[PDB]
Design an enzyme around this catalytic site. Structure first.
Site, PDB file in Angstrom:
ATOM      1  N   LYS A 125     -29.712 -25.816  -6.960  1.00  0.00           N
ATOM      2  CA  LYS A 125     -30.020 -25.986  -8.367  1.00  0.00           C
ATOM      3  C   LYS A 125     -29.555 -27.371  -8.831  1.00  0.00           C
ATOM      4  O   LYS A 125     -28.815 -28.061  -8.106  1.00  0.00           O
ATOM      5  CB  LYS A 125     -29.365 -24.867  -9.193  1.00  0.00           C
ATOM      6  CG  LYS A 125     -29.873 -23.490  -8.876  1.00  0.00           C
ATOM      7  CD  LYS A 125     -29.503 -22.515  -9.969  1.00  0.00           C
ATOM      8  CE  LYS A 125     -29.708 -21.072  -9.539  1.00  0.00           C
ATOM      9  NZ  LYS A 125     -29.170 -20.117 -10.571  1.00  0.00           N
ATOM     10  N   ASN A 133     -24.315 -21.799 -11.258  1.00  0.00           N
ATOM     11  CA  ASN A 133     -23.935 -21.191  -9.999  1.00  0.00           C
ATOM     12  C   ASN A 133     -24.528 -21.873  -8.787  1.00  0.00           C
ATOM     13  O   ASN A 133     -24.656 -21.262  -7.727  1.00  0.00           O
ATOM     14  CB  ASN A 133     -24.238 -19.698  -9.999  1.00  0.00           C
ATOM     15  CG  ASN A 133     -25.708 -19.387 -10.175  1.00  0.00           C
ATOM     16  OD1 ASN A 133     -26.564 -20.275 -10.247  1.00  0.00           O
ATOM     17  ND2 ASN A 133     -26.004 -18.108 -10.256  1.00  0.00           N
ATOM     18  N   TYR A 192     -39.221 -17.697 -13.659  1.00  0.00           N
ATOM     19  CA  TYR A 192     -38.414 -16.783 -14.460  1.00  0.00           C
ATOM     20  C   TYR A 192     -39.234 -15.820 -15.319  1.00  0.00           C
ATOM     21  O   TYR A 192     -38.716 -15.253 -16.284  1.00  0.00           O
ATOM     22  CB  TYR A 192     -37.458 -17.561 -15.360  1.00  0.00           C
ATOM     23  CG  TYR A 192     -36.369 -18.304 -14.633  1.00  0.00           C
ATOM     24  CD1 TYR A 192     -35.461 -17.630 -13.806  1.00  0.00           C
ATOM     25  CD2 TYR A 192     -36.230 -19.682 -14.792  1.00  0.00           C
ATOM     26  CE1 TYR A 192     -34.451 -18.317 -13.145  1.00  0.00           C
ATOM     27  CE2 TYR A 192     -35.229 -20.377 -14.141  1.00  0.00           C
ATOM     28  CZ  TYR A 192     -34.341 -19.690 -13.320  1.00  0.00           C
ATOM     29  OH  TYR A 192     -33.356 -20.391 -12.682  1.00  0.00           O
ATOM     30  N   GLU A 232     -41.708 -16.164  -4.116  1.00  0.00           N
ATOM     31  CA  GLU A 232     -40.978 -17.393  -4.449  1.00  0.00           C
ATOM     32  C   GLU A 232     -41.266 -18.516  -3.458  1.00  0.00           C
ATOM     33  O   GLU A 232     -41.370 -19.666  -3.852  1.00  0.00           O
ATOM     34  CB  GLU A 232     -39.469 -17.141  -4.537  1.00  0.00           C
ATOM     35  CG  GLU A 232     -39.032 -16.235  -5.670  1.00  0.00           C
ATOM     36  CD  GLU A 232     -37.551 -15.897  -5.615  1.00  0.00           C
ATOM     37  OE1 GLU A 232     -36.855 -16.333  -4.667  1.00  0.00           O
ATOM     38  OE2 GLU A 232     -37.079 -15.185  -6.528  1.00  0.00           O
ATOM     39  N   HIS A 272     -29.818 -21.059  -5.682  1.00  0.00           N
ATOM     40  CA  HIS A 272     -30.592 -19.801  -5.724  1.00  0.00           C
ATOM     41  C   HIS A 272     -31.137 -19.361  -4.361  1.00  0.00           C
ATOM     42  O   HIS A 272     -31.496 -20.178  -3.522  1.00  0.00           O
ATOM     43  CB  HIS A 272     -31.755 -19.867  -6.707  1.00  0.00           C
ATOM     44  CG  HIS A 272     -32.725 -18.744  -6.532  1.00  0.00           C
ATOM     45  ND1 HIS A 272     -32.500 -17.483  -7.048  1.00  0.00           N
ATOM     46  CD2 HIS A 272     -33.883 -18.665  -5.835  1.00  0.00           C
ATOM     47  CE1 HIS A 272     -33.489 -16.680  -6.696  1.00  0.00           C
ATOM     48  NE2 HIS A 272     -34.339 -17.373  -5.956  1.00  0.00           N
TER      49      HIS A 272
END
Lengths: 153, 153, 153, 153, 153, 153
Positions: free
Chosen positions: F11, F114, F51, F130, F117
């Site tokens: 990310k 975080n 998303y 994805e 992904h």
């Protein structure tokens, strides 16, 4: 070249200070292939035979005592131009004249406590003598490492 | 030599970019012994006293402003020929003229943002002046590291 | 949190074994911010205050002797949930109970030589007192690390 | 314990993939002490003794073939709770069940190619027999590593 | 300088031997900023266009076959004097003439299997030609890395 | 499995903080095989598709803004049980809940930042969509890594 071998040895200072992994990782990272490895305690006979060229020299006994003071990790490594390459990797004989990135340049400080030994490529045949001195033929291992097909043309 | 000391300092660029550990690991790996360590913010008085030789130079104020822009990690390191050795390890003054394996060669790009400082061994007494400048005698620590008996003859 | 702080120190065993860098790295890696850093020798009086809760217990003097037997590297770290996070990172009290990955699970062996200390999040205010105990406010540094812009929402 | 010993070996997969250093490091890092170390090729007879408990089972020959298909690096390590500690460090039997941090959780993928073996602490005497099985007593080295002074209370 | 770019490519030997991370970590550690990255399989047209200067040379087809044998990781890196710097970092063309600390000096052995390629800074404009050859303008990314404000004056 | 594939991306936080190498290493180390790799900037439209399941939720725009605020490094990895394995390696969603060893437990602090992904194995087909979402089939590479011969029974 390619199946060329050399004798390499973490000396008792490198063993004590906990640098076996670090040093073996450098040779494995390089593509050099381990074909001999042995954790051992050199005795008098072997130490004095190893430093025979230094028999008459004053510093001989001190040299024998150090290489005797604690156990070594003796290795044989295989690869193209291994003998020269290992010597480039270790640095100069003196760690205080060695460049960062070499084994001695990164891990050592004193001339007489230089963490490691590698057969001299400029002493023709040295690698073989040192290998036969430390390993019996049976202790050596003929194999093919995965890496080899991508390391060499 | 052996109990020789030098002043070494992760500069504010190295602090910001998260390289304290990496740099201290290189000196610890080497056998150099930490006898001073201090996370601090240099003030004007100290910055201008540190770069006093550059008082009349045009670039002086910019130099003071950078070393002032954020906190440093100041160190004292101990070992045989430490002063020269640390300087070999860091690289050349310019990171863009430094070899991979040196601190600056691995972590830096700009001449004026070179991650680290180490006392100049060619400026006789520099290490001492820099040490006393940054540390009071009480901040320094007399000890014996485990490693020492295997680092030195 | 975001500006929560925790007291951490590399104990004398960890210092002797050359683990300061590796430890600071784990914290920088994490995005925790060093805001205090002091290489020091705990004197007796400080050592007895730090362990004051165990003063009437048999093992008290052993604890004091060990923690004063060699230099420590005392630190302060800043980030969201810093205290709990640091205690997750360290392992269990006994390294013999610690998971590979944690500082103790990778570096230590004996309950008594567990290499590192960090304030207990389950004893509220502990971080506060231990920080104050090892550091005068002015030894600590207010700054902004470039990491936070991306470390925190 | 303190002088407890455990048998560990990098299996032929781990050897092929150049993981010997990284593995020895994890153990040196930990303070475990190398007291045996032998780069070797398991012959059939040795391989069948080592797996003697599974001799009447279907998967037996597969196990023998694999463990003899390439060189291993066989080791002996010494420290407090060594056997259990080494098994914590390695992971679960299946690397697909292993946690990041453990040797298998970081380096392996398939139950059958789980990179490393280490004596089972839950089968008392196992370490003893497997050590004796791969090592004659005289191949093992009594010494003192400088780390122990600080590793153990 | 500062927004200078160069084309860099882990060759199929580096890809196979598992050195993408290691190499990218060296450029990230350095402050160089990734602005292009692409895991791809070079075709004939592209390979022969890349080595066009070697069309009439005997070794041309072998060179095309190797760079064709497996996938590459092509990169564009940004920073002050990037083109020269990457070339210093990689070593000499021959890994067997490269110093430890360089990419080739640490990871390579054969002249024709040297793990990596970087645009020649002495071939003026080479970096641009190589970049446009491998990346369309849309595949490149304009951003500002956190590091930049502390890497440059 | 053996040829199972999973979508993973560093990310924008992880990219900014210079963690791409370290991340790719963890996967190469593991024996997972890179079969897709693309340094890119998610446009809005792509970000909202990715998303899409959270589109009618309050935090939706925050998620879109963040994931598009800087470049990512999007990847595809191949190995036995790849998807679950990658999710074990990363940690928990919240890095504040993650174990040392896992990518998030070592590198991250805030639930929202975080760092990485990876497709959820508990939502069947997720990896598939994805992957397709970030990669056209022709951007992906069929090859054989020398590791598999030893990675899989």
């Amino acid at each position: 070249s390619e199946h060329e071998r050399t004798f390499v040895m973490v000396k008792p200072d490198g063993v004590q200070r906990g640098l076996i992994g670090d040093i073996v990782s450098r040779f494995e990272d390089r593509g050099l292939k381990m074909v001999g490895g042995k954790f051992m305690q050199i005795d008098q006979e072997l130490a004095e035979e190893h430093y025979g060229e230094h028999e008459d020299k004053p510093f001989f006994d001190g040299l024998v005592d150090f290489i005797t003071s604690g156990p070594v990790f003796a290795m044989v490594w295989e690869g193209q131009d291994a003998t020269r390459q290992v010597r480039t990797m270790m640095g100069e004989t003196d760690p205080a004249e060695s460049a960062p990135g070499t084994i001695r340049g990164d891990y050592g400080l004193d001339l007489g406590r230089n963490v490691i030994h590698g057969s001299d490529h400029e002493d023709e045949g040295a690698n073989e003598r040192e290998i036969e001195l430390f390993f019996d033929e049976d202790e050596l291992v003929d194999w093919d490492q995965i890496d080899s097909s991508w390391l060499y043309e």
